[PDB]
Amino acid sequence: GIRAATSQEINELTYYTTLSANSYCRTVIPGATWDCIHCDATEDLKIIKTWSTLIYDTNAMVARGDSEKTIYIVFRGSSSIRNWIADLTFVPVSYPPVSGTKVHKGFLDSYGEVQNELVATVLDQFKQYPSYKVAVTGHSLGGATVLLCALDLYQREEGLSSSNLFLYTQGQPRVGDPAFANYVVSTGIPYRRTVNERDIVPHLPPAAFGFLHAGEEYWITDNSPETVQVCTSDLETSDCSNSIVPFTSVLDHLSYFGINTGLCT
């Protein structure tokens, strides 16, 4: 099906796009403070911890919202996005937890570098607030790591399942082949994949290389008034953003809902 997103659904996706946008501020990661212009939206969240890894430069954080009863996981995209786009090269490798599936090596190496410590900090918080929900979000590169993070959490089968684990991504590139996308749909995890108009990143690598997207597609088709088309299928369809290919845009990547995503502007 194809349907229009509700007011409430746009409000929720703008909230996750803000957390994503905020993560590109050096005072947020690794500063560990809510000292930024749009931080006022999330400033009531308690920042548990932040990371800026050494080899892959993986920037992420764990935050806790008590009034929201949510444990938040946020992944930053690249600190030099134009360049990240211009140079992305895909290197399909086996995804270890699931035999018969392939993922781009570079996303596994990014996650791989923060995994241990991050997952221990999230289980520690979840053991203390078991009633809360776990929400993962990230834009661009951050969206690919966010997806690998949510699968890892579900796979630890620690009380995190489709009913209390949510993934929200903005401008995310495809991460694995068809077989890996099927696997993602098989977990049942609520996955909202947001695409901002003609943003070229959600169309990389080219359709021709063999990768495919999982997650319900929320496509921003207009910004004033904000309009979003939802392709409810959990696998990639030709009915939302793929309909504009190959006439994509690099600048559409840098703004979601009106928020600069990538420059903490």
Curated annotation (Swiss-Prot):
GO terms for biological process: lipid catabolic process. It is an enzyme of class 3 (hydrolase). Disulfide bonds join 25-264, 36-39, 231-240. Its EC number is 3.1.1.3. It catalyses: a triacylglycerol + H2O = a diacylglycerol + a fatty acid + H(+). The keyword Lipid metabolism applies. Keywords: Calcium, Disulfide bond, Hydrolase, Lipid degradation, Lipid metabolism, Metal-binding, Signal, Zymogen. GO terms for molecular function: metal ion binding; triacylglycerol lipase activity. Ca(2+) binds at residue 252. The active site is at residues 140, 199, 253. Belongs to the AB hydrolase superfamily. Lipase family. This is Lipase. It comes from Rhizomucor miehei. The chain holds residues 99 to 363 of 363 of the full protein.
